[model samples]
Target: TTCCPSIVARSNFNVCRLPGTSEAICATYTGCIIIPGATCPGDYAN
Candidate 1:
């Protein structure tokens, strides 16, 4: 799955699940950062 930076910046920058799955994920201003794979510290919280 992938995340959208535009969406995150407009929102609160929280973790979001794609339209198809229930997996944990998040997006950054730079790019998409997947959870349980390349998670950043304090990212899951927002």
Candidate 2:
């Protein structure tokens, strides 16, 4: 129950949300891996 075994890798998505805000993020690249607590540098909203 830890990560996918390449079965649904390309069809999967990672939903990352900003702390204390309605902002959300995701990795569009297939090779991009999420390791928890990861956030965008500076204000995510432009």
Candidate 3:
């Protein structure tokens, strides 16, 4: 039920990781979103 309306629209999402952590954060231009086991892309680290 959680993904119904937004899953497909996550095309603009980007994975960002904290400066020194392996944990990843999912975000769009607007804000952050949660996803399981997400890993940051090499170019998207913060």
Go through the candidates in order and give each one's C-alpha lDDT. 0.40, 0.31, 0.34
Candidate 1 lDDT, 1-46, residue by residue in tens: 3333454442533434334333333344335445455444443333
- Give the per-residue lDDT of model 2 (tens digit) for 1-46: 1132243432443233223322222333323333345453232211
Please tell me which predicted candidate would have the highest lDDT against the true structure.
1
Where is model 1 poorest over a 10-residue stretch in terms of lDDT?
17-26
Candidate ranking under lDDT, highest first, comes to: 1, 3, 2
- Supply the TM-score for candidate 1: 0.19
How much is the lDDT of residue 35 in candidate 3? 43
Better candidate number, 1 or 3, judged by lDDT: 1
Give per-residue CA lDDT, model 3, range 1-46, as digits (tens): 0111243334334223334322223343324343454664333332
* TM-score of candidate 3 against the unseen true structure: 0.21
Model 2 spans > 4 angstroms off:
1-29, 41-46
Arrange candidates by TM-score, descending. 3, 1, 2
